[PDB]
A paper describes a structure:
Originally thought to be redundant but distinct decarboxylases, it has been shown that UbiD is in fact the only decarboxylase, whereas UbiX produces a cofactor strictly required for UbiD activity. The UbiX enzyme catalyses both the N5–C1′ and C6–C3′ bond formation to generate the fourth ring of the prFMN product.
In an attempt to further probe the DMAP/DMAPP specificity, and explore the putative role of the (pyro)phosphate in Friedel–Crafts C6-alkylation, we constructed F181Q (to mimic AnUbiX) and F181H (to mimic O157UbiX) PaUbiX variants. Upon reduction of the PaUbiX variant crystals, it was apparent that F181H was able to catalyse prFMN formation. The in crystallo behaviour of both variants is mirrored in solution: F181H is able to form the purple species indicative of the prFMN. semiquinone, while redox cycling of F181Q with DMAP leads to a spectral species with features reminiscent of the DMAP reactions with the DMAPP-specific AnUbiX/EcUbiX. In each variant, the DMAP specificity was retained, and crystal structures of the corresponding complexes with oxidised FMN and DMAP revealed little difference with the WT PaUbiX structure besides the mutations itself. This clearly demonstrates the nature of the residue at position 181 is not the sole determinant of DMAP/DMAPP specificity.
Numbering used by the authors:
A (entry chain A), B (entry chain A), C (entry chain A), D (entry chain A), E (entry chain A), F (entry chain A), ...: 1 to 206
Amino acid sequence: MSGPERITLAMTGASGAQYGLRLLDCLVQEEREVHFLISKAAQLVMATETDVALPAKPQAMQAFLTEYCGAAAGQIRVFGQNDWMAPPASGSSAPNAMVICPCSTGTLSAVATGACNNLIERAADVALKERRPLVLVPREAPFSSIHLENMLKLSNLGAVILPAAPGFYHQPQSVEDLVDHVVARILNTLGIPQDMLPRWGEQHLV
Amino acid sequence: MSGPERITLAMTGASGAQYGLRLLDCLVQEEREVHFLISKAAQLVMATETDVALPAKPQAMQAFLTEYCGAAAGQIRVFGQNDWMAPPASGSSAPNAMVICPCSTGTLSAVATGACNNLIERAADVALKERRPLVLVPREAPFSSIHLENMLKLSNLGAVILPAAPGFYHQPQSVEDLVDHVVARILNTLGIPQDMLPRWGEQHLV
Amino acid sequence: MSGPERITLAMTGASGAQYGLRLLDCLVQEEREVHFLISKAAQLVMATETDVALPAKPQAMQAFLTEYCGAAAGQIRVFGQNDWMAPPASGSSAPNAMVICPCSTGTLSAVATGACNNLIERAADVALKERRPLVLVPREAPFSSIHLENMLKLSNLGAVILPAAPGFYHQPQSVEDLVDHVVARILNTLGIPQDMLPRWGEQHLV
Amino acid sequence: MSGPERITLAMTGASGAQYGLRLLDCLVQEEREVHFLISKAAQLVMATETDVALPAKPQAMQAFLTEYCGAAAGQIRVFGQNDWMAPPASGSSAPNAMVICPCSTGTLSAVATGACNNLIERAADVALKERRPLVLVPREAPFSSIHLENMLKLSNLGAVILPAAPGFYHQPQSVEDLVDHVVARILNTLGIPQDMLPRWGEQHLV
Amino acid sequence: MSGPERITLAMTGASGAQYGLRLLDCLVQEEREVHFLISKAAQLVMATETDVALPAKPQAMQAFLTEYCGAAAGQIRVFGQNDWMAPPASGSSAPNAMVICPCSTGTLSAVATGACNNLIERAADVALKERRPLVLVPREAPFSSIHLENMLKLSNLGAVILPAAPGFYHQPQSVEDLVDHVVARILNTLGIPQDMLPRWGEQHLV
Amino acid sequence: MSGPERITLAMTGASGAQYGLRLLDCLVQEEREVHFLISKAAQLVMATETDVALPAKPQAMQAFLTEYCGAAAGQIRVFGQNDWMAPPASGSSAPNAMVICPCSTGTLSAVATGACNNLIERAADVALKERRPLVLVPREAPFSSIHLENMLKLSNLGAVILPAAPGFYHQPQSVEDLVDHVVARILNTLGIPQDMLPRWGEQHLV
Amino acid sequence: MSGPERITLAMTGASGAQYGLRLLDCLVQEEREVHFLISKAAQLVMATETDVALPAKPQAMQAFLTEYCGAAAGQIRVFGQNDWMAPPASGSSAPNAMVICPCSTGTLSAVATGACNNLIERAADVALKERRPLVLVPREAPFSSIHLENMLKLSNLGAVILPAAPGFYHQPQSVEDLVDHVVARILNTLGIPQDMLPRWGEQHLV
Amino acid sequence: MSGPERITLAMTGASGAQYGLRLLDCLVQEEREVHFLISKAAQLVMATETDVALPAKPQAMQAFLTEYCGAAAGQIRVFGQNDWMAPPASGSSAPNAMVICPCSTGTLSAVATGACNNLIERAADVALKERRPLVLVPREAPFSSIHLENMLKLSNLGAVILPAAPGFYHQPQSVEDLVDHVVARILNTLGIPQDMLPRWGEQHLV
Ligand SMILES: Cc1cc2c3c(c1C)C(C)(C)CC=[N+]3c1c([nH]c(=O)[nH]c1=O)N2C[C@H](O)[C@H](O)[C@H](O)COP(=O)(O)O
Ligand SMILES: Cc1cc2c3c(c1C)C(C)(C)CC=[N+]3c1c([nH]c(=O)[nH]c1=O)N2C[C@H](O)[C@H](O)[C@H](O)COP(=O)(O)O
Ligand SMILES: Cc1cc2c3c(c1C)C(C)(C)CC=[N+]3c1c([nH]c(=O)[nH]c1=O)N2C[C@H](O)[C@H](O)[C@H](O)COP(=O)(O)O
Ligand SMILES: Cc1cc2c3c(c1C)C(C)(C)CC=[N+]3c1c([nH]c(=O)[nH]c1=O)N2C[C@H](O)[C@H](O)[C@H](O)COP(=O)(O)O
Ligand SMILES: Cc1cc2c3c(c1C)C(C)(C)CC=[N+]3c1c([nH]c(=O)[nH]c1=O)N2C[C@H](O)[C@H](O)[C@H](O)COP(=O)(O)O
Ligand SMILES: Cc1cc2c3c(c1C)C(C)(C)CC=[N+]3c1c([nH]c(=O)[nH]c1=O)N2C[C@H](O)[C@H](O)[C@H](O)COP(=O)(O)O
Ligand SMILES: Cc1cc2c3c(c1C)C(C)(C)CC=[N+]3c1c([nH]c(=O)[nH]c1=O)N2C[C@H](O)[C@H](O)[C@H](O)COP(=O)(O)O
Ligand SMILES: Cc1cc2c3c(c1C)C(C)(C)CC=[N+]3c1c([nH]c(=O)[nH]c1=O)N2C[C@H](O)[C@H](O)[C@H](O)COP(=O)(O)O
Ligand code: NA
Ligand code: NA
Ligand code: NA
Ligand code: NA
Ligand code: NA
Ligand code: NA
Ligand code: NA
Ligand code: NA
C-alpha cells in the first residue's frame, strides 16, 4: 500500500461540500481508514449545497456515511467536535495524514494561530507538532491579506495549501469532472493512487 | 454607467482559458472598451483547453474576438507583447482597471517583483504605481510559499487576489455555471453589473 | 445621497453602548438601511451601562429598535450571531460599509487574525476581502501591545481604527456632547452628513 | 505612601486639557511633588478648550497652578521647554514617574523616535533609558498606522499607552465623570490611591 | 467637476519652486480652492531659484499669489506654519486632497515618522489618518536609504510618492515643458483635468 | 532501488559543466530515468569549458547523450526550454527529484522569485509546490547578498543548496577527483548509491 | 587621473535618453574607456525621444557613437545583450564602475532580484558581488512601493540610487541645463571631474 | 604597491588547507607582511589533507612557514589563539586586510554573532568594527539555512563571502589549477596583483 493507511478528513464551512464527499468516497475505495470530522457550519453548507441528508449525531452520521460510500465496518470513524478522547486530539495517537476539505477561512485562521477550539483545529495542531501531513483546501474569493498571511505561515511550516481551483486541461465535461481534478490533486499530494488525473507528459519523450 | 469604462484584460498561461473568454464576453455585453493582451503561453493554453481557433497576430486576433463576442468596431483593442506604445504601458495613459485572468504563477511573480518584461507585466506595474484597480486571477494547486508570498505582497499593496475557486452554493449544473461564478466575482470586484450571481441574503430581513 | 446606502453596524462587548445606539439613531435619521448585529457580551454591556431594555431574540430586537429610532419598516434588519444566510456573511452580498462600535479587544483580535467565529467577525472578514469600508471603534485603556499590533495590522490593511476618544474642543456640556463627537467622526469617516461636529477652520481665510 | 513621590506631568497639544488639570489636582491632593511641563501647543489647547487663564512664563505659571490646586509651597515645580538644567532632563536626576497627558501625536512621534527636541521629549527619553515609569495619554481619532506603530514601539519598550477613552460602566452623569474615569486609570497605573473608580468585582465572591 | 474641489498645496524646501508655482497656477485655472502653505526653507528656495518676490507674512502673501495667479477672491487661502486653527490641522475639517510640492527630505521624514512639528507636517498627518489623498513630490539626488525607507513606508500607507523626474517623451523644448510634465502627472494623480500631457496611446488601436 | 527512479537534471549557465555531465553519467549507471534540460547559456558554457560537442536541438541532443553515457533507449529524455507539455512542467506529472547543476545565479534568482520563464524554472517551481526534492548547485564567487538571500529563502523552503565546493579530505589527485566529490554529495543528498565518496568515520568505533 | 578609468554605461528603457548620451559624451571628453550597453527597449526610447539615428548592431553602433562623441579608437566598446564573453559579464574582469542611465523599473527589478537575464543585468550583478561602484538612474513617476522596495534593497547593498531629478538652483535656461545637472551628479558620484555643477558654498566662509 | 601592505591570514578547520597555503605563498611573493593565525581544528585538517608537517607552537611554526614560502625575516608573523597582545586583537592596531581561508562554519558562526572566543574570531570582529576588509572563504556542502543566514548577515555588513568554488573556464588541468582560481579571486578581491586568472574579455572589443 502506497500512502497513509489512516487519514483524518475534516470538513469545515467553506463552499465545496462535493469535494469532501468525493474525497471520502475515493479514500474508502482505496481501502483507507478515515477519521471523519465535520464542523457545525459545514453541516449547514452540506444542507445548502447538496441533496445529502447527513444525520447530525456522530453515531448516525457514521452509519449514513458507511452506507453512502459502501465502506466496510469500522472503516469510517466519526468523532464529534469536542471528543478530546478521539485519536486526532493527541500526538501520542497512531500516525494519520490530515486533510481539511473544504477549509473555511475561519479554520485556516485557527490552525495558523493555534486556537485549538474544537477537535478539527486541535487535530491540525497535533499534525503540525508531530510533523505529520496536513493538507488544507481553502475555498474563498478574493483571498484577503488576512487569508494569505495565514496560508503562507502554514505553508512555511510544511502544510500543503491546496486551493479548490480545478484545472481545465483534460477537457472537463461536467461539474463532477472539475471536482475530480481537485480530489485527484489531494490524493496525489497524499501519495494515494488515483486514476482521475493522468500523469502529465508521461508519454512525452522529446 | 457603473464601474470602469475601459478594462485592460490580460490572459496569461494558467489553466482556465474559459474564464478569460467568458469575462471578455461579459465586458463586451456591458458595453465596456477592452484592451486585450494575451501571452504566448496563454495562447498555447487556449489551443490545448478549448476549441477556440485564436489567430496569432494582433490584427487578426482583434478581428476574430470582435466577431466572437459580437463587439462594436474598436470596442476590443488587441496589443502585442512588446507594444510599448499601447495605452497600458504608461501611467500617462487614460485610466483603466486591469484584470489578469487567468494569472499564471510566472506573471504573478513578475508583477510582485516589478520585472516588467512584457506589456502585460508593465501594464500591471503601471496600474500599481497609478493606484488603478488590479485584479489577479491565479489558477494553481498547491499554492507554494513562493506563490503565497507574491500574492500577499500584492494584496498588501491593494491588488485584489481572486483565485479561480468557484463556489457551489447556487446549485451549479454545468462547467459553465462554475465559470460564471468566478466571472461574476470579478465583475462584482470591478463594480460592473452582472446577473449571474445573486446578491446573498438580499431578501433576508431577520 | 452621499455615503453608503447600507451600513452593517455591529455592537460588541466594550464599554460605550451609548456610542452604538446614538450612531444607529443618526444612521436611521439619514435614511440609511442598517444591518444590525450585536454580540452576547455587548447585550450584557447594554444592560449594565444603560436603561435600554433590548429584547434578546432578533425578531423582537428588530421591533424594539425600529420603535426606538423611529425607523421605517425594514430599514433596520437584525441578524443573529450564527445566521450565515444573512447578507454580511458573503462577499457576493450587496456592498455595505461596516462599523463595529464599540469594538471589544476580543473582536479586534478575531478580525485581525481572521477567526470568523460568528457573523460579526465573518462580516468584517468579508469587508476586508471585498475592500469595502471597515471602521473599528475600540474602547479600552491601557491599549496593550497585543491590542496595538492587532490595530496596526488592520489599519495597514485599510480598516479605520477610530478609538472612542472624544475631543473637547467644542465646549462639551454633557455626556451626550462627548458621545456625539465620536459618532460625528464615524459619520465623517463613512462620508455621511452630520451636523454635530463643525468643519474645523471652515471660516478661517488667513 | 504608595506609588511615586515625584511625578513629571507633561501636557502636550492634544484635546483633553481637562484630563491634565484634573490629574494635576489629584496628584496635589495625594501630596505628591509634581514637575509640571507644558508645550506651546498645549497652552493654546488650554486657552481654546477651557476657561483657565494659565500664565505664560514658568514663574507666574507656577504661582497660578499652586493657587488653582491648593498646593503647598514648592509642591508644584514648573520648568520651561528648554530648561536642560531641570531634573527631568538627566537620568542622574532623582527618580520620577512620568505622565504625558494629553499626549499629542507629535509628542508620541518624538518619544518613539528619540527626537528629544524639548524638555518634555527629553524627559521621556530619560524615563525610558532609566526604565522609570512612562505613561502616554494620546487623544486622537482615527489612529493612523503612523500613530499605531509609534504606540506599539513604545508599549513594547514598557511605556503604558493609555488613550483618553473613558469607560461608561459606572453610570456617568457629567463630562467631569468621564474625565475622572481616565484620571483614575492613570492613578491606578501609577499605583497612587484614588476613590473615583471602584475596584471592579471586589464584592463578587462566586 | 472631476477631482477634489479643495487642495492643500504645501511647498517645502527642496529645489523645484517652479513646480509648486506652476501647480498652483493650474489649480487656480481649474477653479479649485487652494489652501497654500509654505515652509521657511521653501521661501528661501523661492528667493534663490526664481525671480518671484513672495511676501513673507500670510496676509500679504495671499494678496500677492491671488494677483500672480489671477485667482478669485478667497480662492487662495494662505496659512502660517503654526496656525493650528486652519482647516488642514484637524481631521474634523472639510475634506481636501493634499500635495507637498516640492517635498524636502526633511518634510518627507517628518510625515513618515508623524513628527507634526508645523502645520504642513500636521496637515499630512491628518490626511493619512483620514485616508484623504496625499501626494509627495521629492526632489533629491541621490536618494539615500533613509530617504527611500521613508518613501516606502508612506507609499505602503497609500501616499503617492511622485518624484520631480520629468519625462522626455513629448519632445520638450524648454524648462517650462519639463516642469509641465511633472505638474501634469500631479493633476492626473489628483483626478483634475489637464491638457499639458497627452493620453499615451489613446489613438493606438492595434 | 534506493532513491528516486526519475530525476529532472537541469544544467544552467554557471561554470562547472563537468559536474552536470558526470552527474548525468552516474545517474545513467544507476539505471535512473533522467529528464534532461539545458539552458541556452549552459550550452555556451559547455562549448567554452569542455570538448563535448553537444547538438543544439533536443532530438539530436538526446541521441548524443544516450551514446555518451551508454544509456538505454528512452532512459534519457531531453526537453526544450519552452516545452510546457513535458512532465517537469506540471505538478500532475509523475514524481521526480530535481537537480540544477550547475545552477547559475540567474536561475537561482528565478526559482527564488517564482519567475517560471522557461521549463527549467517552471519545473523547479513545480518541485517546490509539490514538495518534491530540489537540489541547487550554484557556482559563483563571491556570493553577493543578492545571491545569499535567494539561497536562504529556498533553503528555508526545503530546497538543498549544495555549492560546487569540493572537499579535499580524500587526497584528490586530479580535476576528476574534485568533480566526483561534488557529484557524490549530490547522489548522497538524493539517496542514490555512490562509491566515489567513502562514509566518513564508518570504521571508527571509539 | 581621478575616478575610474573604465566605466560600464548601460542604457535601459526609461525616458531620458538624453541623460545617457550626454553622460557618454562627458566620459569620452574625460578620456575614460566606456563599455557601452543598450537594451532593446532603450533603443526604442532613443528613436522616440531624440533625433539620434543609432545603428542596431554593435559593430555599427560602435562606429556611430565614436563619431558622435569624437572618441579615440577603441575608447568606446559596444557589447550586445547576450555577449557573455564581454568584460562586464564576469567578476574576473578588470574593475569598472557601472552606471545604468536611464534605469528602467524593469532593470531596477532585475538587479534587485538578481535575475541576470541579459548582459546589462548580469554586469550589475557582477558589480554588486565584486563591490565595484554601481549607480542606477531611474526615471519614473509615481514610484510605486514595488519600485521603492527594489531601490531600498539595492541602496542598502551600496548601490547609489540617483533619480533623474534635476535641481533648479543654478538658474537653468534650457533642457540641456537640466540634463547637465543630473549628468554632473553622476560624475560627482563616480569621482570624475566635471565643471557643469559648481561646488555649493565653496566661497562661503562664515 | 597596490592593495594592502599587511594581511591577517587566518586558517580555520574547513577542508581546503591547500587554498590557505597557496594564498600564503602568493602573499609572500607579492612582498606583503602576513599575520598568520591557525585554529586547532585547522592544524588537524592540514595533517589530514596534506603532507605539510606544520609545527605546533607559534615560534617553530613561524620558522617553518618562512622556509616553506621563502619569506624574508619578519615577513610572516605567527600569533597563537589566545595572544590578545597581537596586532589583530585591537582596532588601535595598524590597518590590515583580513582573510579567513578556509573559513569553517563554526568560525563563520562566531564572526556573525560576535563570539570573539579566540584571536581569529576577535580579529574579524575588529576588522568589522574598524571597517577594514574581511574576506571569508567557506568550504561546506550543503550550505544549511544556518550557514546561509550567517553569510548573509556578514555580507550585508560588507564582509566578502567568497566560497571555495573554483571556476572551470580556463581549462584547468590539475588540482593546483583549481586551487589557483580561488586564490586568484581572493587576491583580486584584496586588490593585490595576480597572474593566475586572466582578465575576462579584456581583448574583446565588440
Ligand atoms: C454556512 C455557510 C458559511 C459560509 C459559506 C456558505 C455557507 C452556507 C456558502 C456555501 C453559501 C458560501 C460560502 N461559504 C464560505 C464560508 N467561508 C469560507 O471560508 N468559504 C466559503 O465559501 N462561510 C462562512 C464560514 O462557514 C464561517 O465563517 C464559519 O464560522 C466557519 O466555521 P468552521 O471553520 O468551524 O466551519
Ligand atoms: C502551456 C501551459 C502552461 C501551464 C499550464 C498548462 C499549459 C498548456 C496546462 C493548462 C496544461 C496546465 C496548467 N498550466 C498552468 C501553468 N501555470 C500556472 O500558473 N497555472 C497553470 O494552471 N503553466 C505554466 C505557465 O504557462 C508557464 O510557467 C509560463 O511561463 C507562463 O508564462 P506567462 O505568464 O507569460 O503566460
Ligand atoms: C460584559 C462586559 C465585558 C467587558 C467590559 C464590561 C462588561 C459589562 C464593562 C462595560 C463593565 C467594562 C469594560 N468592558 C470592556 C470589555 N472589553 C473591552 O475591550 N473593552 C471594554 O471596555 N469587556 C470584555 C469583553 O466583553 C469580553 O472580552 C468579550 O469576550 C467580548 O466578546 P465580543 O467581542 O463577542 O463582544
Ligand atoms: C492647537 C491645537 C492643536 C491640536 C488640536 C487642537 C488645538 C487647539 C484642538 C484641541 C482644537 C483639536 C485637536 N487637537 C489635537 C492635536 N493633536 C493631537 O494629537 N490630538 C488632538 O486632539 N493638535 C495638533 C498638535 O497640537 C500639533 O501637532 C502640535 O505640533 C503638537 O505639539 P506638541 O506635541 O509640542 O504639543
Ligand atoms: C534653502 C535650501 C535648502 C535645500 C536646498 C537648497 C536651498 C536654497 C537648494 C535649492 C540650493 C538646493 C537643494 N535644496 C534641497 C534641500 N532639501 C531637499 O530635500 N532637496 C533639495 O533639493 N535643501 C535643504 C532643506 O531645505 C532643509 O533640509 C530644510 O530643513 C527643509 O525644511 P522644510 O521641510 O521645513 O522646508
Ligand atoms: C556563457 C557564460 C555565462 C556565465 C559564465 C561563463 C559563461 C561562458 C563562464 C563559464 C566563462 C564563467 C562563469 N560563468 C558563470 C555565470 N553565472 C554564474 O552564476 N556562475 C558562473 O560561473 N555566467 C552568466 C550566466 O550564464 C548568465 O547570467 C545567464 O543569464 C544565465 O542564464 P541561465 O540561468 O538561463 O543559464
Ligand atoms: C519603449 C518605451 C518604454 C517605456 C517608456 C517609453 C518608451 C518609448 C516612454 C519614453 C514613451 C515613456 C516612458 N518610458 C518608461 C518606461 N519604463 C520606465 O521605467 N520609465 C520610463 O520612463 N517604459 C517601459 C520599459 O521600457 C519597459 O518596461 C521595458 O521592459 C524595459 O526593458 P529594459 O529594462 O530591458 O530596457
Ligand atoms: C578536523 C576536521 C574538521 C572538519 C572537517 C574535516 C576535518 C579533518 C575534513 C577536512 C575531513 C572534512 C571537512 N571538514 C570541515 C569542517 N567544517 C567545515 O565547515 N567545513 C569542512 O569542510 N570540519 C569541522 C570543523 O573543523 C569543526 O566544526 C571545528 O569546530 C571548527 O573549529 P575552528 O573554526 O576553530 O577551526
Ligand atoms: Na480555545
Ligand atoms: Na526585463
Ligand atoms: Na471558528
Ligand atoms: Na533636536
Ligand atoms: Na513636535
Ligand atoms: Na515569465
Ligand atoms: Na534568466
Ligand atoms: Na567568549
